[PDB]
Amino acid sequence: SGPSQVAFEIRGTLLPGEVFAICGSCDALGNWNPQNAVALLPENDTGESMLWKATIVLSRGVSVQYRYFKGYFLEPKTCQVIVHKWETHLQPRSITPLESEIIIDDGQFGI
Numbered sequence: 001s002g003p004s005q006v007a008f009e010i011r012g013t014l015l016p017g018e019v020f021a022i023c024g025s026c027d028a029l030g031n032w033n034p035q036n037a038v039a040l041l042p043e044n045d046t047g048e049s050m051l052w053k054a055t056i057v058l059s060r061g062v063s064v065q066y067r068y069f070k071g072y073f074l075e076p077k078t079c080q081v082i083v084h085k086w087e088t089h090l091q092p093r094s095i096t097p098l099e100s101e102i103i104i105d106d107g108q109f110g111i
Helices: none
Strands: 004-011 019-024 051-058 064-074 080-086 093-095 101-108
Touching: 019 051, 093 101
Parallel strands: 004 101
Antiparallel strands: 004 051, 019 064, 064 080, 064 093
8 A cells, every 4th residue: 555645734813823733543643642743834835825734644545533723833841732722613534545645625724
């Protein structure tokens, strides 16, 4: 099974110093531990105002559950990931990647 490159996208507002992050049920997504979550980056290639994206390599045919959160990625006091808010009243998101390249546009944060 030759790996699947998945672009996960979500839109929303953020506080100063805050970013969007993806966390989930496999290594690449940090095994539900926000400390090992993946921070998204702003996506400007479509001319949107509030779009964020993360490109993640996942194993083909393996089901993965995930959620977005908004939080802070800080430097050590002596790393620190602080979740402000996990996505709103909705079931954890899921994907079973089958293609080599996939774009998952999850719309608006919390929806």
